[PDB]
């Protein structure tokens, strides 16, 4: 039998593990060890130092990440967003439009 | 400077929404979100002017 009890203290024996296959070329929300985000992950050619865990460019945006299993570096890029514009000749000459 | 202003507490617990959502319950996690929204609106308006 155990003791179910709670007490406020910094954790020393604690750590999660879920594991999931690594999917590339499809943008998705991702959660590496601690670091979360959303984007598409592709193979890289950047070289990290053995102790470095993730890259970061100017303006402090996560650019590349090393996976804990294979210790390979992957580029993160956001998947596409933008605006849509409607081109019309006026609803006094015609009713057909184009979309950009 | 507009992009760099995006990683700031503005008095909240953190500068990232995901951690605020994960570590707090909806009833009282809204105050931090409100502080972040206020700061980001202020910075964007200054940029536009």
């Amino acid at each position: 039998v155990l003791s179910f009890e709670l007490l406020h203290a910094p954790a020393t024996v604690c750590g999660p593990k879920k594991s999931t296959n690594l999917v590339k070329n499809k943008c998705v929300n991702f959660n590496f060890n601690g670091l979360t985000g959303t984007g598409v992950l592709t193979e890289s050619n950047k070289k990290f130092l053995p102790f470095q865990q993730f890259g970061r460019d100017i303006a402090d945006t996560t650019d590349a990440v090393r996976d804990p299993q294979t210790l390979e570096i992957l580029d993160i890029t956001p998947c596409s967003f933008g605006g849509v514009s409607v081109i019309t000749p006026g609803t006094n000459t015609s009713n057909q439009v184009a979309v950009l | 400077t507009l992009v760099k202003q995006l990683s700031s507490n503005f008095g909240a617990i953190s500068s990232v929404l995901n951690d605020i959502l994960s570590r707090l319950d909806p009833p009282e996690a809204e105050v931090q979100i409100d502080r972040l929204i206020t700061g980001r609106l202020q910075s964007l308006q200054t940029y536009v002017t």
Partner: peptide, 27 residues
């Protein structure tokens, strides 16, 4: 010559030194 610029226009265009994708920002 590539494009149809002149000598001085080419000098001017090579003299001025210049951008990326962001989160919500477009050009």
């Amino acid at each position: 010559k590539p494009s149809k610029r002149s000598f001085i226009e080419d000098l001017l265009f090579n003299k001025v030194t210049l951008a990326q994708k962001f989160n919500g920002l477009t050009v």
